[PDB]
């Protein structure tokens, strides 16, 4: 991991989530369940998909070899012809193997970034109205029902609406 999320602080991944690449697992008094963030998952599909097509398109023009015959006293240009044609095969083989190796790395770290960006989208929403456990989970200081959570997921989360309730339970564990 380059960004610290995948196989980082969020140790392990969820066999349970299925409808997407990145998402949430809630756990409240009404019950649990996995739900994938389709905003961030779709942006990661449009990304990778575009990547593939671009790797293909950059390669759509490249050196095509053709058979050429030489006689017994044209060894020099025959050998020139041979080295030339291997030269381009070796060149394009290098370009393809390297482009794949490189964009593979960029792909994995992209997923890593996308997850940490999603975790941060939540953390910055909740702030002190919840506790971060260090495993990619937030423990709420207030009460989040199966309708409050859809607000933090959609980004439409009214902070002050829970702020006061939350404050009193956070300070409770003290005096």
């Amino acid at each position: 991991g380059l960004f610290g999320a995948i196989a980082g602080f969020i140790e392990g991944g969820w066999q349970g989530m299925v409808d997407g690449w990145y998402g949430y697992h809630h756990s409240n008094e009404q019950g649990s369940g996995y739900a994938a963030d389709k905003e961030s998952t779709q942006k990661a599909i449009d990304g990778i998909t575009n990547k593939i097509n671009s790797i293909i398109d950059k390669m759509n023009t490249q050196f095509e070899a053709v058979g050429r015959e030489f006689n017994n006293l044209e060894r020099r240009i025959e050998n020139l012809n041979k080295k030339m044609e291997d030269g381009f095969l070796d060149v394009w083989t290098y370009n393809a193997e390297l482009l794949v190796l490189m964009e593979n790395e960029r792909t994995l770290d992209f997923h890593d970034s996308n997850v940490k960006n999603l975790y941060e989208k939540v953390r910055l929403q909740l702030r002190d109205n919840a506790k971060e456990l260090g495993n990619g989970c937030f423990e709420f200081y207030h009460k989040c029902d199966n309708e409050c959570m859809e607000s933090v997921k959609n980004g439409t989360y009214d902070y002050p609406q829970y702020s006061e309730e939350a404050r009193l339970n956070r300070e409770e564990i003290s005096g």
Partner: protein, 323 residues
């Protein structure tokens, strides 16, 4: 006391697929797209609507000149590409040299439509014998000759000077072929041609050739020590080819009309016909594929993936799949 939780996490599955990275190999991943095509039908197929010329055990020279061991090909006229073995056995049955052969093979790889036409009929040779024939150019163990060129010899005991022309009436280029015979000694020369100091001269608007027999002692090839050297030219439309000779002339009976030029190829392969169709052919088999790459063979023809020497090319799409 415990409260409501939300978590952030990521996808995992039961996926074995691996991809590679500069810094780490064999990364087990979630989803992956293979982009390298590594299988072929192993067959020489038609290319779109059109079938290849498979020369079998003949060579381009053998076919064009009409080696008797190649009569199969006396009337081919349309192909997609040409297949010729590494070392065909039936080329020049009478030992000799084919001038600018590779340039002709190359010229041929830009042509997909011949129409063989009769340019000088044997009827013309009213004062020469046309029955010249050899045991090297032998058919059913009975001495024969090249089907498309005629071995002129003395009639009675004379060889009158030849002067014959042909004008390219058509609107296509014309490939004419001729030759000269190199005898072993002055005796043999006189026995075939009477005349003792000979020439063959060919003239067009561009060509200006003068050939002269070379009597010398040579090693035996197919039991013969004599030789026969062939030559070709492209006769453009509305131009005339002019032969003059007083002996040793191997005259053209047939010429080839060049009806369609297209992108083509001469492939070296040991395979036979495949009776199948494709959009992409290689010397070792055809390709039915959508992959952007393949690694089967560099020499391809038709709309194909790009060749690389890689044995493996796979893109990661999904994320690292933790055990």
């Amino acid at each position: 006391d415990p409260g409501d939780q939300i978590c952030v996490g990521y996808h995992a599955n039961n996926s074995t697929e691996q991809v590679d990275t500069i810094m780490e190999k064999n990364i087990t991943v979630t989803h992956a797209q293979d982009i390298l095509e590594k299988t072929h039908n192993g067959k020489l197929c038609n290319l779109n609507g059109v079938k290849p010329l498979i020369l079998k055990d003949c060579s381009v020279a053998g076919w064009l000149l009409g080696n008797p061991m190649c009569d199969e090909f006396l009337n081919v006229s349309e192909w997609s590409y040409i297949v010729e073995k590494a070392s065909p056995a039936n080329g020049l049955c009478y030992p000799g040299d084919f001038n600018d052969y590779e340039e002709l093979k190359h010229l041929l790889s830009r042509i997909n439509h011949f129409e063989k036409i009769k340019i000088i009929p044997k009827s013309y040779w009213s004062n020469h014998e046309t029955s010249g024939v050899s045991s090297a150019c032998s058919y059913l163990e009975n001495p024969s000759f090249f089907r498309n060129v005629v071995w002129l010899t003395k009639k009675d005991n004379t060889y009158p000077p030849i002067k014959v022309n042909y004008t390219n009436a058509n609107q296509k280029d014309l490939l004419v072929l001729w030759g000269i015979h190199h005898p072993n000694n002055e005796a043999e020369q006189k026995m075939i041609y009477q005349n003792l100091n000979t020439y063959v001269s060919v003239g067009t608007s561009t060509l200006n050739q003068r050939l002269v027999p070379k009597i010398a002692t040579r090693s035996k090839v197919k039991g013969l020590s004599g030789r026969m050297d062939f030559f070709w030219t492209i006769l453009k439309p509305n131009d005339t080819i002019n032969f003059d000779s007083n002996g040793n002339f191997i005259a053209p009976e047939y010429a080839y009309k060049i009806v369609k030029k297209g992108d083509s190829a001469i492939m070296k392969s040991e395979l036979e016909y495949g009776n199948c169709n494709t959009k992409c052919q290689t010397p070792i088999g055809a390709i039915n594929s959508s992959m952007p790459f393949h690694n089967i063979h560099p020499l391809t023809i038709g709309e194909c993936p790009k060749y690389v020497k890689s044995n493996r090319l796979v893109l990661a799409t999904g994320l690292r799949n933790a055990p």
